[PDB]
Amino acid sequence: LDPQIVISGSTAAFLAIGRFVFLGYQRREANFDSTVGPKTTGATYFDDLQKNSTIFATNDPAGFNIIDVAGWGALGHAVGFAVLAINSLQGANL
Amino acid sequence: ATKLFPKFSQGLAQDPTTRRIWYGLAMAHDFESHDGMTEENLYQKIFASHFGQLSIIFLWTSGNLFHVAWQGNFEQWVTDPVHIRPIAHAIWDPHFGQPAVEAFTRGGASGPVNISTSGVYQWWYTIGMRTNQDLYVGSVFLALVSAIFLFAGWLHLQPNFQPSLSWFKDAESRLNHHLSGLFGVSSLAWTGHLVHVAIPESRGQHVGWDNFLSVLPHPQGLTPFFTGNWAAYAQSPDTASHVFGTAQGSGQAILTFLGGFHPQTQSLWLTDMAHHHLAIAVIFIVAGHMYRTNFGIGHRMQAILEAHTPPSGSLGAGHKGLFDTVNNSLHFQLGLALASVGTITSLVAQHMYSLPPYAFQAIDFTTQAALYTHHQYIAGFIMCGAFAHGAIFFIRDYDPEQNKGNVLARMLDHKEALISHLSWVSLFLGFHTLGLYVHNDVMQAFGTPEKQILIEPVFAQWIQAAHGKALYGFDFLLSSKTSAAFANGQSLWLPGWLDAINNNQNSLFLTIGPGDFLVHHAIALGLHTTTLILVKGALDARGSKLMPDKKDFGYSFPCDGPGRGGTCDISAYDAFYLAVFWMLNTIGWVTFYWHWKHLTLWQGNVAQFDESSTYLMGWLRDYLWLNSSQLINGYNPFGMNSLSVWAWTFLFGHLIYATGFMFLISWRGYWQELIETLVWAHEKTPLANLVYWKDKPVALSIVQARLVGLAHFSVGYIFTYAAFLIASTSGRF
Amino acid sequence: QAKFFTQATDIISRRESLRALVALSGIAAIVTYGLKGAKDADLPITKGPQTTGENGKGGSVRSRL
Amino acid sequence: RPTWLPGLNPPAHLKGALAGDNGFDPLGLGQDEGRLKWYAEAEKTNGRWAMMAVAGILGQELLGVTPAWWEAGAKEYDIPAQALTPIEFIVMGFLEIKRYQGFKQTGTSGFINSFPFDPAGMNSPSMATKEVKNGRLAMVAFIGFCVQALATRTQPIEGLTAHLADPFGKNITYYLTHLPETL
Amino acid sequence: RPMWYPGATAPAHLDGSMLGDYGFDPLRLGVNKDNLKWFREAELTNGRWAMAAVVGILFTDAVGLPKFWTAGAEKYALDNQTLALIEVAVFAVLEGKRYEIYKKTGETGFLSFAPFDPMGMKSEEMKLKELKNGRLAMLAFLGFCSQAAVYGKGPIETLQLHLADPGHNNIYTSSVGPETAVTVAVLCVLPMIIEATKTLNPGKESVPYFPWNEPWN
Amino acid sequence: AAQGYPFVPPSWAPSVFVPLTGLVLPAIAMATLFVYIEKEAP
Ligand code: CLA
Ligand code: CLA
Ligand code: CLA
Ligand code: CLA
Ligand SMILES: CCCCCCCCCCCCCCCC(=O)OC[C@H](COP(=O)(O)OC[C@@H](O)CO)OC(=O)CCCCCCCCCCCCCCC
Ligand SMILES: CC1=C(/C=C/C(C)=C/C=C/C(C)=C/C=C/C=C(C)/C=C/C=C(C)/C=C/C2=C(C)CCCC2(C)C)C(C)(C)CCC1
Ligand SMILES: CC1=C(/C=C/C(C)=C/C=C/C(C)=C/C=C/C=C(C)/C=C/C=C(C)/C=C/C2=C(C)CCCC2(C)C)C(C)(C)CCC1
Ligand SMILES: CC1=C(C/C=C(\C)CCC[C@H](C)CCC[C@H](C)CCCC(C)C)C(=O)c2ccccc2C1=O
Ligand code: SF4
């Protein structure tokens, strides 16, 4: 069953459809700074824990940082392990 | 003149009467009404009080553990749990006579003890605890955790550790961390405990901190996990010949989906619960990655809420402006939390009796009864508080301008429709339930029980048959051995589930009949009328036709005077106080039904309930009167037994209840004049006018009268029924 | 007599001293009552059951220990 | 400055003032300044204890001590642990209350009354960078020691020898599997 | 001045005005000044009696005499009730003169010499030495009784037992071992919590909410 | 305790702590929370 094949393929497919397919949609959706403004305008330490203290710059041209990577690879690992587990009991219901 | 005690109120500190003491006792935790209260200081004091509540909870658990270890029989109960009674703690009462020292010597103890109706023995035996040293160490650890939370509550009140107002109003991060870590990683760690400790200890293998790094939870350690061969963790489950706590019929699996019950313990499989918490942990961890934090991804709850505006304007503005309303109102959050927590407390009660999670539970009948009644009354109180705080929100926190046209304002817009329809459902259910019960009573009185209205609950029976109960012959979904729902589960939970649900000696989907129909409709009447009172106090909270400016008078206030026809019990607080009676009656019906159904099941006489629950003289004769015999004979002119304490507590609760009647019927104005006469008497009595009061005696206020009467009422209700329940279940079993 | 009783109370004639005496006396009294005085009074809770008690008679149906 | 991500600008609260600044505060934990000073001292203290700890584990393994570093507690010495622990609490409480009384004032490290301790004149910002970097390395190295010996598994140099004998057959992928063979 | 733990800050009432002041009043028992004077005198009285008792016990255990927890059971020239009556009668007048001397002087005296100081060695250095040796001897008698109750041996016999095997014959291997180990660890970590309180509230004092303290003022 | 588990309460513990918890600590508490209630503010 080659779990390396399965999980590498799931992660690669999800990273691909996150980079090439659903990146524009996710950027259109995640741009909430709108009526929906910042959580805090204050200068307290606890107001700073809610600000984006570190913008994750990426030299990827489409803007695919370690957070997009983390998310799409997490979905890929989850789906690959789902495939492996549903194959683990050598069958499915219907 | 000006006193010192109600530091949070200068108006109470300047009050020269006894009302100052009471109201400072009862306004202490209404932080918003405190003098000089800022919203930030409010949230910070709430945070500290939450730390204190956690510390108290962990100390209480530490004390339970400590007393079960020190004065309990846990090391003997694990040997013969079906036959040995669990000791709660020892009794040292110098008022005891020798007959009482002899009568309360139970459970193999050396002296007088209390028998645990708590279930903590079954719980701790199921999760791997076998010795008294385990419980001792757990109690020490939980006392340390309590001290740690106390220190945290002190610390986060200090200047450089007091969080900002916005840190509390950060909902996305709190939700992410509380779903992912507090719910999810906690469930993952509990799965780890079950896989490493509880399941091996149920297989007879001792796993503790001394050796848990040296024993494998599975013979194939973590290879099935990192290779995706997860079914290897379900290969050899525990057999049907398995005896809990031993290796005879052990099994090697740690994650199963067997379904049903462990046959020897009549409890859930520990591997099923491990897999349960693993699945739930994964689901909650991925759920806690939903909301937006400092990393650029995720949702903003404001966007989700403001986007969910239906077209057709069927909800108006929809959920526009609702994020601000929920996030800025602590009473909205508290009402939502109490609603959910009470609903899931009722879920706990309804599922722990049908699917007993703990070993040798469901054979400890007193424990089952006590747990169900406990969690259902807790749930009823919590659910009354949910609506109470919803009303407090509508009064204190609701801004009609910032909720212009959204679902929340759309509620108040058609509140008369809601209240009148709840009125219709309550009225219908009461009329017809009481009428059918009275018809059946009259028919049994005239000796013609074949003329009763015995409506078969075919809808709930159809549901039961959809779950695989083959007693009714519906043959629909899982009772149909040819359906796809049945076929697709046969490799899975369904064999165990269907062996467990068709066994009529457990409580998994009990057989129901017309008595169950009638009492379920009584339960519905109770729910509908309780929520009628509560919804009507929550929606008429900001004003009515009788009192349109009610929001200006607060949540609690005595009345608006005898003008405009009379305005007694006008406030939302009074609606809550009226709904607590109906809640207690609802949960009393619920727990009566539960206890009688299960008493007739445990006695092998289900026909008694099936034949006597269709009329209320059967409830009075065959449940309340029949089961009271051993209870009221706890002490008699011919001696006493261990039910003496429950007889005493029975009479105690009756007394408290009746005393509450004093504060509920008799109102302030008789007592103020009586107290004036007593004041005169004391000021004019020689040798006693030397002693004088510092706080002027006054009768209890109207709101305080209602509170104290409801408190005596509820405490008596609760103590009476707990005494009766334990004494009627512990007397037979 | 008045001198005797003004001097007997000389040490406890202040609130703090009297409450210290009361605390000392009451705590000592309850502690010696639990340790020694309850057994000296021959209390049934200090003697023990003197019997097998209600041990094996759990319920009328299930005679549990 | 070279930052932990290529092309990344370091956050605002992280100047190059402190020793080992590489712009690494993705959680933003050091955005308070007094807490950042306390966390700098905490980094230095955890790093010093981890440096001495990995030094002690490697000097226990390179030298001939009887048990593993993770079994040295379960060992009979001339003093029982029940009596060892309170002596250690006394001594280390003295030392740590003297260290803390000396971080309130002097805002710096030190031994008992010397803040900074520095008997030798080797103080330097480059030396502070080296301290914090070797301390981070030793912290990671001790968590390595612990997770690498999570059950009765290799000792540190034993594990390094095992990896150098057969690299593609003795690594984490072999040992997270074949765990029943180890226990 | 030195403190009871390094870098402690004394409370408001322990101004250093008194001798042996190390700022140790965590339960705030001495916030009243009359109570504080009475407690200084009681400290000194318990300390004097404990010094005499410590040297008496060390003497009686150094020579061939019965152990001090059994000496009351031995047989003497007078029956125990006559002894108790003579002791009560003597100490009534003795402690009455001492009580009058405290009400007048504020300090100690035997009967009529308000300061019992034939040899005029009443420095304040000597008052400090009295107080310190008295605290030490109070601890010493507490230890005498404690390690004669844990064992059935006297003070120097327990000392010899310790010196025979110091690592295994000590308080943490005794019947009271674990409780003392835990209380020692708690005591050693306690001052860091106290210094946290002093640090997070710079220069502020927190009332511990006790009865004797009148913490509402 | 001897060796089973340390910090086990003595046999006489209830006889002391039930009076303490029920007669003394409530007396202390009610006296203190009576002086504090009737205390006038300056
Ligand atoms: C998470 C739970 C939670 C939280 C945080 C709060 C918090 C609050 N509630 Mg809410 N509430 C809750 C649950 C909660 N409540 C539930 C479950 C109910 C329904 C029972 C209510 C019903 C409710 C009402 C009706 C009101 C509040 C009010 C308040 C506020 C102040 C209450 C006060 O001063 O306490 C003081 C409380 C007491 C002094 C306790 C009274 C005594 C009770 C009855 C227990 C007595 C037990 C007794 C000792 C047992 C004896 C047995 C023995 C003899 C054997 C505060 C914001 C009030 C408010 O906001 O006013 C605007 C208000 O009017 N709450
Ligand atoms: C046995 C006691 C009892 C009974 C019968 C009721 C009955 C009722 N309560 Mg509850 N209530 C009670 C105790 C009781 N209450 C207590 C102790 C309190 C605390 C103060 C409350 C507080 C309370 C509140 C706050 C609310 C109610 C409501 C209701 C009504 C709910 C609808 C319903 O069931 O209609 C069915 C009706 C009945 C069961 C009673 C009528 C009985 C028969 C069917 C009528 C005909 C009998 C006969 C022919 C009359 C002959 C008269 C003459 C010829 C002699 C109903 C009238 C709600 C309400 O009124 O809104 C709808 C509501 O909001 N009650
Ligand atoms: C069981 C319910 C109950 C109880 C106990 C009481 C009790 C009382 N009522 Mg009330 N009353 C009730 C129901 C009740 N009423 C109801 C339902 C109504 C209809 C509205 C009234 C209407 C009413 C009116 C109109 C009047 C009273 C009066 C009285 C008092 C007269 C008896 C008295 O003082 O004797 C002494 C006290 C008792 C007998 C109560 C029981 C106490 C026992 C002996 C236990 C003692 C406990 C002990 C101190 C231990 C303490 C424990 C410690 C930890 C706290 C007393 C306070 C009258 C009054 O106050 O004037 C005198 C009065 O005028 N009541
Ligand atoms: C200055 C007083 C003093 C001195 C010198 C000693 C000395 C001794 N005690 Mg004793 N002891 C004392 C006070 C003292 N104790 C007190 C107050 C208590 C009650 C808690 C006890 C209770 C006690 C028990 C139950 C046992 C000992 C034992 C011992 C011996 C081993 C050390 C040990 O583990 O105890 C450590 C003692 C404590 C943790 C109690 C607190 C001690 C305080 C902090 C004083 C510390 C010394 C002081 C700072 C400077 C010494 C001055 C000078 C003599 C150099 C040793 C001979 C053991 C023994 O006999 O083994 C054979 C034993 O089993 N002691
Ligand atoms: C180990 C056992 C548990 C110990 C717990 C702590 C003990 C507390 C000891 C208090 C010492 C005296 C306080 C000095 C008094 C003092 O400092 O006053 C402070 C405070 C009141 O302050 P005031 O306003 O009166 O002070 C003004 C004056 O100081 C003049 O300025 O005291 C109280 O509130 C009442 C406390 C009563 C405490 C005694 C209660 C008695 C308990 C015994 C009950 C026995 C019942 C059974 C009988 C058979
Ligand atoms: C250089 C470059 C490249 C490449 C790159 C790469 C290759 C990357 C990768 C990346 C990656 C490769 C990533 C990954 C990620 C991953 C992740 C993120 C994971 C996660 C996981 C998780 C989350 C898990 C979970 C879980 C568990 C733990 C167990 C079971 C259950 C579950 C599954 C749920 C190219 C050629 C294109 C070009 C451009 C540039
Ligand atoms: C007053 C107020 C308040 C409160 C309120 C409340 C308290 C409410 C409650 C509510 C509630 C308490 C609700 C409940 C609900 C429930 C539900 C909604 C359920 C559902 C269910 C379902 C949906 C199911 C499904 C299923 C079934 C049927 C079975 C099987 C499985 C499944 C899943 C298929 C607040 C604060 C908000 C504010 C405003 C005002
Ligand atoms: C009896 C009665 C009184 C008189 C009762 C008095 C004034 C209050 C009773 C106080 C005495 C001291 C008894 C208190 C006993 C409680 C056990 C005290 C517990 C409180 C602590 C928790 C603080 C009223 O003032 C009243 C007012 C309005 C409606 C109904 C009534 C009413 O029924
Ligand atoms: S005092 Fe009572 S009767 Fe009078 S208006 Fe108020 S609630 Fe109504």
mmCIF file of N, CA and C in Angstrom, chain B residues 86-153:
data_model
loop_
_atom_site.group_PDB
_atom_site.id
_atom_site.type_symbol
_atom_site.label_atom_id
_atom_site.label_comp_id
_atom_site.label_asym_id
_atom_site.label_seq_id
_atom_site.Cartn_x
_atom_site.Cartn_y
_atom_site.Cartn_z
ATOM 1 N N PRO B 86 -19.757 0.484 48.344
ATOM 2 C CA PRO B 86 -18.675 1.471 48.422
ATOM 3 C C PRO B 86 -18.851 2.404 49.610
ATOM 4 N N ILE B 87 -17.770 2.608 50.348
ATOM 5 C CA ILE B 87 -17.740 3.557 51.450
ATOM 6 C C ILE B 87 -17.404 4.933 50.900
ATOM 7 N N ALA B 88 -18.179 5.935 51.309
ATOM 8 C CA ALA B 88 -17.884 7.311 50.932
ATOM 9 C C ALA B 88 -16.862 7.917 51.881
ATOM 10 N N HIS B 89 -17.198 7.967 53.161
ATOM 11 C CA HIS B 89 -16.282 8.434 54.184
ATOM 12 C C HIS B 89 -16.781 7.920 55.522
ATOM 13 N N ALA B 90 -15.936 8.057 56.535
ATOM 14 C CA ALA B 90 -16.315 7.623 57.864
ATOM 15 C C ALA B 90 -17.148 8.693 58.554
ATOM 16 N N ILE B 91 -17.879 8.259 59.574
ATOM 17 C CA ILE B 91 -18.703 9.135 60.393
ATOM 18 C C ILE B 91 -18.051 9.253 61.759
ATOM 19 N N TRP B 92 -17.850 10.485 62.209
ATOM 20 C CA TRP B 92 -17.504 10.769 63.596
ATOM 21 C C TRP B 92 -18.515 11.792 64.093
ATOM 22 N N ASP B 93 -19.623 11.294 64.619
ATOM 23 C CA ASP B 93 -20.683 12.134 65.167
ATOM 24 C C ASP B 93 -20.827 11.820 66.646
ATOM 25 N N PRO B 94 -20.409 12.708 67.553
ATOM 26 C CA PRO B 94 -20.541 12.406 68.983
ATOM 27 C C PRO B 94 -21.976 12.298 69.452
ATOM 28 N N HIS B 95 -22.935 12.774 68.665
ATOM 29 C CA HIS B 95 -24.342 12.638 69.000
ATOM 30 C C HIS B 95 -24.864 11.232 68.757
ATOM 31 N N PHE B 96 -24.063 10.369 68.144
ATOM 32 C CA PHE B 96 -24.501 9.018 67.829
ATOM 33 C C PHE B 96 -24.702 8.208 69.099
ATOM 34 N N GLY B 97 -25.800 7.465 69.145
ATOM 35 C CA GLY B 97 -25.928 6.404 70.112
ATOM 36 C C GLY B 97 -25.347 5.107 69.591
ATOM 37 N N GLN B 98 -25.077 4.185 70.511
ATOM 38 C CA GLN B 98 -24.459 2.926 70.110
ATOM 39 C C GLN B 98 -25.255 2.198 69.037
ATOM 40 N N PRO B 99 -26.588 2.174 69.068
ATOM 41 C CA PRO B 99 -27.323 1.581 67.944
ATOM 42 C C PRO B 99 -26.984 2.204 66.607
ATOM 43 N N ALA B 100 -26.692 3.503 66.571
ATOM 44 C CA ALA B 100 -26.332 4.141 65.314
ATOM 45 C C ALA B 100 -24.897 3.831 64.923
ATOM 46 N N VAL B 101 -24.007 3.702 65.904
ATOM 47 C CA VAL B 101 -22.649 3.258 65.620
ATOM 48 C C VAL B 101 -22.665 1.857 65.036
ATOM 49 N N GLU B 102 -23.625 1.035 65.458
ATOM 50 C CA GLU B 102 -23.748 -0.319 64.936
ATOM 51 C C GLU B 102 -24.423 -0.338 63.571
ATOM 52 N N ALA B 103 -25.406 0.537 63.359
ATOM 53 C CA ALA B 103 -26.206 0.478 62.143
ATOM 54 C C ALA B 103 -25.460 1.030 60.938
ATOM 55 N N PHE B 104 -24.602 2.023 61.138
ATOM 56 C CA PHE B 104 -23.861 2.637 60.050
ATOM 57 C C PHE B 104 -22.518 1.965 59.803
ATOM 58 N N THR B 105 -22.233 0.863 60.491
ATOM 59 C CA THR B 105 -21.044 0.057 60.232
ATOM 60 C C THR B 105 -21.358 -0.862 59.062
ATOM 61 N N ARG B 106 -21.022 -0.405 57.861
ATOM 62 C CA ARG B 106 -21.378 -1.086 56.628
ATOM 63 C C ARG B 106 -20.149 -1.220 55.743
ATOM 64 N N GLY B 107 -20.283 -2.040 54.704
ATOM 65 C CA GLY B 107 -19.241 -2.160 53.707
ATOM 66 C C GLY B 107 -17.983 -2.849 54.171
ATOM 67 N N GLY B 108 -18.041 -3.587 55.273
ATOM 68 C CA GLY B 108 -16.849 -4.201 55.811
ATOM 69 C C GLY B 108 -15.979 -3.253 56.594
ATOM 70 N N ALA B 109 -16.531 -2.126 57.026
ATOM 71 C CA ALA B 109 -15.757 -1.102 57.698
ATOM 72 C C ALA B 109 -15.549 -1.463 59.166
ATOM 73 N N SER B 110 -14.677 -0.703 59.821
ATOM 74 C CA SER B 110 -14.428 -0.889 61.241
ATOM 75 C C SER B 110 -15.366 -0.078 62.118
ATOM 76 N N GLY B 111 -15.948 0.994 61.591
ATOM 77 C CA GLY B 111 -16.853 1.820 62.350
ATOM 78 C C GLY B 111 -17.971 2.371 61.494
ATOM 79 N N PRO B 112 -18.650 3.408 61.982
ATOM 80 C CA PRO B 112 -19.739 4.001 61.202
ATOM 81 C C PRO B 112 -19.193 4.691 59.962
ATOM 82 N N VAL B 113 -19.856 4.464 58.831
ATOM 83 C CA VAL B 113 -19.417 4.971 57.541
ATOM 84 C C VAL B 113 -20.640 5.368 56.729
ATOM 85 N N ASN B 114 -20.388 6.117 55.661
ATOM 86 C CA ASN B 114 -21.401 6.482 54.688
ATOM 87 C C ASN B 114 -21.162 5.712 53.397
ATOM 88 N N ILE B 115 -22.231 5.163 52.840
ATOM 89 C CA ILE B 115 -22.160 4.388 51.609
ATOM 90 C C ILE B 115 -22.247 5.336 50.424
ATOM 91 N N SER B 116 -21.315 5.194 49.487
ATOM 92 C CA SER B 116 -21.207 6.121 48.370
ATOM 93 C C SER B 116 -22.277 5.831 47.330
ATOM 94 N N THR B 117 -23.186 6.786 47.142
ATOM 95 C CA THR B 117 -24.107 6.799 46.018
ATOM 96 C C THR B 117 -23.581 7.656 44.877
ATOM 97 N N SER B 118 -22.278 7.928 44.870
ATOM 98 C CA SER B 118 -21.670 8.857 43.930
ATOM 99 C C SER B 118 -21.188 8.195 42.652
ATOM 100 N N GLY B 119 -20.836 6.916 42.703
ATOM 101 C CA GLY B 119 -20.307 6.239 41.545
ATOM 102 C C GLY B 119 -18.821 6.409 41.333
ATOM 103 N N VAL B 120 -18.132 7.112 42.229
ATOM 104 C CA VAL B 120 -16.712 7.376 42.024
ATOM 105 C C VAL B 120 -15.903 6.093 42.097
ATOM 106 N N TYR B 121 -16.389 5.087 42.818
ATOM 107 C CA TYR B 121 -15.682 3.814 42.861
ATOM 108 C C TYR B 121 -15.653 3.163 41.487
ATOM 109 N N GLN B 122 -16.816 3.051 40.845
ATOM 110 C CA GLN B 122 -16.878 2.458 39.517
ATOM 111 C C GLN B 122 -16.044 3.258 38.530
ATOM 112 N N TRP B 123 -16.130 4.582 38.614
ATOM 113 C CA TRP B 123 -15.367 5.450 37.730
ATOM 114 C C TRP B 123 -13.873 5.215 37.880
ATOM 115 N N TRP B 124 -13.371 5.261 39.113
ATOM 116 C CA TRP B 124 -11.937 5.138 39.328
ATOM 117 C C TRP B 124 -11.446 3.721 39.063
ATOM 118 N N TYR B 125 -12.306 2.722 39.244
ATOM 119 C CA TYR B 125 -11.947 1.354 38.893
ATOM 120 C C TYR B 125 -11.882 1.176 37.386
ATOM 121 N N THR B 126 -12.731 1.895 36.655
ATOM 122 C CA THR B 126 -12.753 1.771 35.206
ATOM 123 C C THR B 126 -11.534 2.426 34.572
ATOM 124 N N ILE B 127 -11.065 3.540 35.144
ATOM 125 C CA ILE B 127 -9.969 4.293 34.546
ATOM 126 C C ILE B 127 -8.602 3.804 34.998
ATOM 127 N N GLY B 128 -8.538 2.745 35.794
ATOM 128 C CA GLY B 128 -7.285 2.080 36.098
ATOM 129 C C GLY B 128 -6.866 2.104 37.549
ATOM 130 N N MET B 129 -7.590 2.780 38.433
ATOM 131 C CA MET B 129 -7.185 2.860 39.829
ATOM 132 C C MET B 129 -7.586 1.588 40.560
ATOM 133 N N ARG B 130 -6.619 0.974 41.242
ATOM 134 C CA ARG B 130 -6.828 -0.299 41.915
ATOM 135 C C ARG B 130 -6.455 -0.293 43.387
ATOM 136 N N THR B 131 -5.577 0.596 43.828
ATOM 137 C CA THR B 131 -5.129 0.655 45.208
ATOM 138 C C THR B 131 -5.557 1.974 45.832
ATOM 139 N N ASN B 132 -5.408 2.054 47.152
ATOM 140 C CA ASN B 132 -5.647 3.304 47.853
ATOM 141 C C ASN B 132 -4.514 4.296 47.657
ATOM 142 N N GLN B 133 -3.317 3.815 47.322
ATOM 143 C CA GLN B 133 -2.205 4.715 47.052
ATOM 144 C C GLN B 133 -2.413 5.481 45.757
ATOM 145 N N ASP B 134 -3.039 4.851 44.764
ATOM 146 C CA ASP B 134 -3.388 5.563 43.542
ATOM 147 C C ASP B 134 -4.274 6.759 43.852
ATOM 148 N N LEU B 135 -5.324 6.541 44.645
ATOM 149 C CA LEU B 135 -6.234 7.626 44.986
ATOM 150 C C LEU B 135 -5.550 8.664 45.862
ATOM 151 N N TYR B 136 -4.678 8.224 46.765
ATOM 152 C CA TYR B 136 -3.931 9.160 47.596
ATOM 153 C C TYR B 136 -3.082 10.089 46.739
ATOM 154 N N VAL B 137 -2.341 9.516 45.791
ATOM 155 C CA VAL B 137 -1.493 10.314 44.917
ATOM 156 C C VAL B 137 -2.338 11.239 44.057
ATOM 157 N N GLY B 138 -3.467 10.739 43.555
ATOM 158 C CA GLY B 138 -4.355 11.594 42.788
ATOM 159 C C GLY B 138 -4.878 12.763 43.596
ATOM 160 N N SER B 139 -5.202 12.523 44.865
ATOM 161 C CA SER B 139 -5.692 13.593 45.721
ATOM 162 C C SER B 139 -4.609 14.623 45.983
ATOM 163 N N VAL B 140 -3.384 14.166 46.233
ATOM 164 C CA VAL B 140 -2.274 15.095 46.394
ATOM 165 C C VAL B 140 -2.098 15.929 45.134
ATOM 166 N N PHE B 141 -2.123 15.275 43.974
ATOM 167 C CA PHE B 141 -1.915 15.980 42.717
ATOM 168 C C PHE B 141 -3.005 17.010 42.475
ATOM 169 N N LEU B 142 -4.252 16.665 42.788
ATOM 170 C CA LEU B 142 -5.343 17.597 42.553
ATOM 171 C C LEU B 142 -5.343 18.728 43.564
ATOM 172 N N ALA B 143 -4.857 18.482 44.775
ATOM 173 C CA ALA B 143 -4.676 19.578 45.714
ATOM 174 C C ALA B 143 -3.584 20.524 45.241
ATOM 175 N N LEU B 144 -2.510 19.979 44.672
ATOM 176 C CA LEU B 144 -1.473 20.825 44.097
ATOM 177 C C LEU B 144 -2.012 21.631 42.924
ATOM 178 N N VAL B 145 -2.826 21.001 42.077
ATOM 179 C CA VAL B 145 -3.435 21.707 40.954
ATOM 180 C C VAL B 145 -4.365 22.804 41.454
ATOM 181 N N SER B 146 -5.105 22.527 42.527
ATOM 182 C CA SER B 146 -5.970 23.538 43.121
ATOM 183 C C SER B 146 -5.161 24.718 43.633
ATOM 184 N N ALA B 147 -4.057 24.440 44.322
ATOM 185 C CA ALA B 147 -3.194 25.514 44.798
ATOM 186 C C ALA B 147 -2.607 26.296 43.635
ATOM 187 N N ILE B 148 -2.287 25.611 42.542
ATOM 188 C CA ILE B 148 -1.740 26.280 41.370
ATOM 189 C C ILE B 148 -2.774 27.214 40.761
ATOM 190 N N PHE B 149 -4.022 26.765 40.666
ATOM 191 C CA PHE B 149 -5.064 27.622 40.114
ATOM 192 C C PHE B 149 -5.391 28.778 41.050
ATOM 193 N N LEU B 150 -5.316 28.555 42.361
ATOM 194 C CA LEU B 150 -5.464 29.654 43.308
ATOM 195 C C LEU B 150 -4.362 30.688 43.118
ATOM 196 N N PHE B 151 -3.124 30.225 42.948
ATOM 197 C CA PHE B 151 -2.023 31.146 42.715
ATOM 198 C C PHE B 151 -2.204 31.888 41.402
ATOM 199 N N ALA B 152 -2.710 31.205 40.377
ATOM 200 C CA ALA B 152 -2.967 31.868 39.102
ATOM 201 C C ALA B 152 -4.049 32.925 39.239
ATOM 202 N N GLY B 153 -5.073 32.643 40.044
ATOM 203 C CA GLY B 153 -6.113 33.625 40.276
ATOM 204 C C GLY B 153 -5.615 34.831 41.038
#
